[PDB]
Design a protein around this ligand. Structure first.
Ligand code: SF4
Ligand code: SF4
Ligand code: SF4
Ligand code: FES
Ligand SMILES: [Zn+2]
Lengths: 178, 205, 118, 114, 206, 99, 125, 51, 112, 95
């Protein structure tokens, strides 16, 4: 199947019945009207604008945005320094130097993202075998400084100490689904 | 198409413009829209089918009279003849599996890495080390909107590749920029850019 | 001269006596998996992961211990030398606690691979 | 060692092919500085140029020299035209970065730099 | 068998027999035609016979390969002729592909193909930009991808990832000036190359 | 929506086709959020028997290429050859032939 | 046609690499060690040519680690030692070789764990 | 997938074609319209970039 | 009869069986210069005689296409010019020369 | 609910506050030091021990598909208790 887009040139014995219809398509302009009267329809249509800060648009619960370190329902920081949430991070964005916690347990002393790195690709929320790191619906976190985006860990907990009311409902509709 | 494809301001701005000779395209290797728009009947999706395109019952909108209006009409009808493809790619989706059965080439189910041991280890090595391809080499291809997008990926037993390379189909379309704009003025050169589809990122690396 | 013709998928190797099948296969490169064995510790077949079908045998041998006699041809990538492993590693991984991210030896585990490889 | 030669034979034929290039750069310091404004007058621009040819005099291989002419012609072909800017032409000079101590004694008051 | 990309045995022989067709017809400068399990052809040759095989493949009925797609340059900095330069073509008439690769040192230039395939006007040039491999008889060789003052040839495996310069704006001169390289994070070379060959009967004995 | 049963006839007269049924944007009867939680299908080889890795290993069925000259090793009436049948001129696109 | 020459085959002008990373840059050619944690040995059979290391200071803002030498993370896989020196000499870098460390072929007889006479009589089987 | 020698399953192949020719629809809309902008027509651009 | 080709720039230049013959016949006549043993010479003869048996017999072009596979005859005509240059351009070259110029060892063993 | 330096700055989970003689405190001038008051080590001892039956069990983080891969413990230590490295829970044997 191959389809000629433009094959209509055939000598149809162009007579005054029709050959002037092209001159009716010309000097008495109609094709231009046809292209104009269309546009005039839309100004009598429903403009799909939306008053953003008062009318924000649609997302879905898998939206890749700002990171956050989740926490178990009983305190207890959920991140445990596996060190594959940077080994996969293609931006090479992360440093998660760690230690024992002085409880004998296993947690971090360090965690990082350069959010100007961090392509927001989604490898880390899914590679995390614990859902300790996730990537939540914030996308109004523009700042005036390249430095205020270099989220260390205390921001990135207390961020995770904020949207946990929200993430635990999107993820509630996204477990048994990946 | 009510508005543009019978529009004087479009047609005589566009027709007879950038007349591409068929056998010269191949010397330049356009190999996308920019040759089928001059009558070289060709499409990998039907001439070298790879995926489930084998059962779709669609069509290739060839362009004769090489000019950036018959490229344009190809570019339109290729939008339409997705919808024949969609309707056929929509009403017979089979129930099945995703992220191939093998846990060495796909990550496993997140509920399944969490009890079944082996699925955990692969999850720990996929996302650190990865596939461990065999050495070898290919030159794939696919007709994107641009044309024959393809990759000369080259491998080694290490998990990482060894000089991948990207075939930017526009990369050849743009080398023909200074041959198809010969005996033509400025204002259409703008149109030449659009009807070579300079989505630069292909062009740029 | 104190050397024995031994075959590994057709190789015409010659090896001293009292040598395992590993010390033969190790020459070429048919590196066999290992959990009970070290190159310096005493031999003890407890893991039973280094199995292989010697040619013309219904039974496999623990290559860590089985010395090498004349005329023996090995099949390291046989069906029967992989069934002997896909089962074994699928035994070990029934009492193991899935602690890899906890585990100190993430990429330095000689089991994570040998569950992937085989 | 019975190599394939390119664009010349043993060095002393390639040394005039050099001079075809100095024959252009020596006449294209004044054309650049005026057409695209700069700080150098004409001369220290010419000192820099010869200061690059008195870096590669150590060469002894015709194939290498027959190659280095080319990359000079490219930069010339980029310089003779306005494809460069005031930042590219004035880039060779290393104007800004402090030259490190070539001696020993000041070289390690900063930097573990053997 | 479901998950193995079915071999389709037949076209191996087409590309094998045709692989022989090009050898005995052109025994000069042709070494080890081969083919991978992926039924795709490869033809290694000597640089002095580049064009006469291309023009056989652009201009011959049984090898209408009149459309070029790439011209890369692959590094192997352990042999003599480190730069494997690769061609790859296509028949619109026969519906198949080929690969015609060669070799060079850092200086053993290769005569160009632009009389044959003008598609290679710029593919040839990036290799000059990216590897420093001169070509004979190429119109208007010059840089493409690099800055107009970038020394080096970076896709060489000798050139580090973050190169030897970084640019910025030193306000005292009102320019986009360059000074040496001074990172903040230090790209972290990992040892993701495990033991265990993973591919026996496909390997290197000592 | 609030189209007052005149401008519809102004739109359509000014544009053509009855387009209140195929309007630009969406209101209702679509994507009624929070569809129920699905129990996915499973892939094959969750079958517990006759399921080894040998009968699925895609990556060990490859081998090295099959060299055919090997300028030192092998180096080895007859009809002409092409890499395939020269494939067809296809068809002429029934049901929409000349657009 | 051809031409005769026997010279050192210098290339150091065709790379940039202005002055510091030519001369004052040692190079180590070796067969990497067996990661003694793992009993696997495929990282051998090769001739990695990593280069010396220099300053890695601490970025005072973030705690990040940063450098000046881009030429530090510069692995290169070769296949024979005779080819490596030819590659590094071809760019004038002061190579510093380490030789292979082949392990010996050792006799390990299982039965000798269970001797009457001898002293290798193991315990715990 | 060629090198690894795997056909992915149908349902994944199947959707790989679907978006594989919705992306076809994008670039046409992005170079039908932008080819109209720089020529001058700015309207269909906005009619589509809700679509 | 044939109005236009599907292609563009490849004009008609009508009356096949006339330019197609003279080209093929000349290719053979440019041959008889090569060696008998040079393997190029003993294949094109099979190409052309195969093709020329079918133009020398059939006057109908519609059925001449789909018979020397490769339609749009004027593309086949152009293809004969394309063959023609190759031969004469290749006599100055020498494909039938003795064995290869012996590349170096370990120059293609890929996995490194 | 954190402990504070004599210079007056906030301590993290880790003892991390800069000494007095440190130019780094500049960055906090006309700003403030972000910190989470929710030390895990304080929250976790504020969690009762789950005194179960049989010596060996499985643990989870509240949803088997939703955290804490199914590790086990040997609860033979009547002296101390057994933990799971993911969580910070503790367990006894009841006997
Ligand atoms: S974010 Fe997840 S994967 Fe990364 S260290 Fe924390 S628990 Fe491990
Ligand atoms: S989303 Fe992707 S790029 Fe961003 S931090 Fe996670 S892994 Fe890295
Ligand atoms: S890294 Fe190895 S030893 Fe540690 S938990 Fe994983 S499989 Fe077990
Ligand atoms: S590896 Fe344990 S029996 Fe050989
Ligand atoms: Zn737990």
């Amino acid at each position: 199947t191959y389809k000629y887009v433009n094959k209509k040139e055939q000598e149809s014995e162009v007579d005054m019945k029709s050959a002037t219809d092209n001159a009716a398509r010309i000097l008495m302009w109609t094709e231009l009207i046809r292209g104009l009267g269309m546009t005039l329809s839309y100004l009598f249509r429903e403009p799909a604008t939306i008053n953003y800060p008062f009318e924000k648009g649609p997302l879905s619960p898998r939206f890749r945005g700002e990171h956050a370190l989740r926490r178990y329902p009983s305190g207890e920081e959920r991140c445990i320094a596996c060190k594959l949430c940077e080994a996969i991070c293609p931006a090479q964005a992360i440093t998660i130097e760690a230690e024992p916690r002085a409880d004998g347990s296993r947690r971090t002393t360090r965690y990082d993202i350069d959010m100007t790195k961090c392509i927001y690709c989604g490898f880390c929320q899914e590679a995390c075998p614990v859902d300790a790191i996730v990537e939540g619906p914030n996308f109004e976190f523009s700042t005036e400084t390249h430095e205020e985006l270099l989220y260390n860990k205390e921001k990135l907990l207390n961020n995770g100490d904020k949207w946990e009311a929200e993430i635990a409902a999107n993820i509630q509709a996204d477990y048994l689904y990946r | 198409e009510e508005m543009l494809t019978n529009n004087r301001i479009w047609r005589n701005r566009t027709v007879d413009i950038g007349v591409v000779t068929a056998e010269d395209a191949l010397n330049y290797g356009f190999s996308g829209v920019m040759l089928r728009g001059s009558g070289i009947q060709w499409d990998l999706r039907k001439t070298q089918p790879y995926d489930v395109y084998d059962q779709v019952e669609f069509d290739v909108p060839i362009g004769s009279r090489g000019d950036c209006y018959d490229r344009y009409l190809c570019r339109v009808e290729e939008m339409r003849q997705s919808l024949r493809i969609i309707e056929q790619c929509l009403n017979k989706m089979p129930p099945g599996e995703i992220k191939v059965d093998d846990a060495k080439v796909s990550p496993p189910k997140r509920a399944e890495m969490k009890t079944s041991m082996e699925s955990l280890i692969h999850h720990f090595k996929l996302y650190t080390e990865g596939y461990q391809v065999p050495p070898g080499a290919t030159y794939t291809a696919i007709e994107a909107p641009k044309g024959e997008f393809g990759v000369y990926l080259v491998s080694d037993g290490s998990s990482r590749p060894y000089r991948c390379k990207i075939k930017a189909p526009g990369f050849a379309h743009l080398a023909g920029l200074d041959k198809m704009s010969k005996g033509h003025m400025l204002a259409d050169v703008v149109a030449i850019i659009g009807t070579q589809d300079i989505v630069f990122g292909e062009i740029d690396r | 001269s104190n050397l024995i013709e031994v075959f590994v998928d057709g190789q015409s190797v010659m090896v001293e006596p009292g040598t395992t099948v590993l010390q033969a296969c190790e020459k070429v490169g048919m590196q066999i998996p290992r959990f009970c064995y070290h190159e310096r510790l005493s031999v003890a077949g407890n893991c039973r992961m280094c199995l292989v079908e010697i040619e013309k045998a219904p039974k496999v041998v623990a290559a860590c211990a089985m010395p090498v006699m004349k005329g023996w041809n090995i099949l390291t990538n046989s069906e029967k030398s992989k069934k002997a492993r896909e089962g074994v590693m699928e035994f070990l991984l029934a009492n193991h606690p899935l602690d890899c991210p906890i585990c100190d030896q993430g990429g330095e585990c000689d089991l994570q691979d040998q569950s992937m490889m085989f | 060692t019975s190599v394939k030669p390119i664009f010349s034979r043993d060095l002393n034929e390639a040394k005039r092919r050099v001079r075809e290039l100095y024959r252009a750069w020596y006449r294209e310091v004044p054309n650049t500085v005026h057409l695209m404004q700069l700080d150098i007058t004409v001369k220290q621009g010419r000192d820099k140029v010869r200061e690059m040819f008195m870096k590669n005099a150590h060469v002894t291989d015709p194939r290498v020299v027959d190659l280095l002419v080319i990359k000079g012609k490219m930069e010339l072909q980029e310089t003779i035209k306005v494809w460069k800017q005031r930042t590219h032409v004035m880039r060779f000079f290393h104007e800004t970065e402090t030259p490190r101590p070539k001696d020993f004694l000041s070289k390690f008051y900063m930097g573990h730099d053997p | 068998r479901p998950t193995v990309r079915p071999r389709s045995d037949v076209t191996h022989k087409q590309l094998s027999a045709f692989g022989e067709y090009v050898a005995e017809i052109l025994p000069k400068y042709v070494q080890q035609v081969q083919v991978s399990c992926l039924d795709e052809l490869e033809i290694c040759i000597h640089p002095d016979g580049v064009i006469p095989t291309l023009t056989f493949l652009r201009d011959h009925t049984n090898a209408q390969f009149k459309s070029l797609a790439d011209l890369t340059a692959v590094d192997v900095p352990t042999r003599q002729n480190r730069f494997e330069i690769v061609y790859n073509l296509l028949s619109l008439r026969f519906n198949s592909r080929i690969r015609v690769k060669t070799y060079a040192d850092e200086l053993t230039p290769i005569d160009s193909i632009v009389s044959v395939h003008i598609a290679a006007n710029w593919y040839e040039r990036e290799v000059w930009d990216m590897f420093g491999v001169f070509f004979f008889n190429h119109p208007d060789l010059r840089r493409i991808l690099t800055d107009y003052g970038f020394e080096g040839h970076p896709f060489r495996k000798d050139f580090p990832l973050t190169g030897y310069v970084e640019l910025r704006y030193d306000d005292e001169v009102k320019r986009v000036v360059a000074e040496p390289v001074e990172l903040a994070q230090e790209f972290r070379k990992f040892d993701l190359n495990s033991p265990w060959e993973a591919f026996p009967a496909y390997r290197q004995p000592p | 929506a609030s189209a007052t049963r005149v401008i519809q006839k102004l739109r359509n007269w000014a544009s053509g086709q009855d387009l209140q049924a195929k309007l630009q944007l969406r209101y209702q009867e679509i994507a009624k959020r929070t569809q129920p939680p699905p129990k996915l299908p499973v892939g094959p080889s969750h079958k517990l028997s006759n399921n080894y890795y040998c009968t699925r290993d895609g990556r060990r069925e490859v081998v090295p290429p099959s060299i055919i000259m090997s300028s030192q090793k092998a180096l080895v009436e007859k009809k002409a050859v092409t890499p395939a049948p020269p494939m067809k001129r296809w068809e002429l696109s029934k049901d929409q032939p000349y657009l | 046609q051809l031409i005769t020459v026997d010279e050192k085959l210098d290339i150091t002008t065709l790379t940039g690499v202005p002055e510091e990373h030519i001369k004052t840059r040692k190079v180590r050619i070796f067969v990497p060690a067996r990661n003694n944690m793992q009993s696997g040995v495929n990282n051998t059979k090769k001739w990695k040519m990593e280069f010396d290391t220099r300053e890695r200071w601490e970025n005072p803002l973030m705690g990040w680690a940063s450098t000046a030498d881009p030429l530090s993370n510069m692995v290169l896989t070769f296949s024979a030692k005779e080819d490596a020196i030819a590659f590094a000499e071809k760019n004038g870098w002061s190579y510093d070789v380490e030789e292979k460390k082949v392990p010996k072929p050792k006799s390990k007889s299982y039965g000798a764990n269970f001797s009457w006479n001898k002293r290798t009589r193991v315990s715990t089987k | 997938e060629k090198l690894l020698n795997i056909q992915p399953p149908p349902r994944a192949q199947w959707i790989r074609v679907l978006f594989g020719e919705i992306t076809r629809i994008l670039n046409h809309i992005m170079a039908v319209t932008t080819h109209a902008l720089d020529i001058g027509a700015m309207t269909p651009f906005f009619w589509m970039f809700e679509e | 009869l044939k109005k236009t080709t599907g292609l563009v720039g490849l004009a008609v230049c009508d009356t096949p069986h006339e330019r197609l013959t003279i080209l093929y016949t000349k290719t053979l006549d440019i041959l008889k210069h090569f060696p008998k043993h040079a393997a190029y010479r003993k294949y094109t003869e099979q190409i052309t005689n195969e093709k020329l048996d079918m133009v020398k017999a059939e006057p109908d072009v519609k059925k001449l296409e789909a018979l020397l596979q490769g339609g749009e005859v004027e593309e086949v005509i152009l293809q004969a010019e394309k063959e023609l240059s190759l031969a004469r351009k290749m006599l100055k070259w020498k494909p039938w020369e003795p064995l290869v110029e012996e590349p170096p060892a370990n120059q293609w063993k890929w996995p490194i | 609910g954190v402990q504070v330096s004599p210079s007056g700055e906030k301590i993290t989970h880790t003892g991390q506050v800069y000494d007095e003689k440190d130019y780094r405190r500049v960055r906090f001038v006309d700003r403030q030091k972000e910190v989470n008051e929710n030390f895990a080590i304080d929250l976790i001892a504020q969690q009762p021990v789950n005194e179960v039956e049989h010596r060996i069990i499985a643990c989870d983080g509240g949803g088997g598909a939703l955290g804490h891969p199914k590790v086990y413990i040997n609860l033979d230590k009547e002296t101390k208790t057994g933990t799971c490295g993911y969580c910070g829970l503790q367990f006894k044997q009841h006997h």
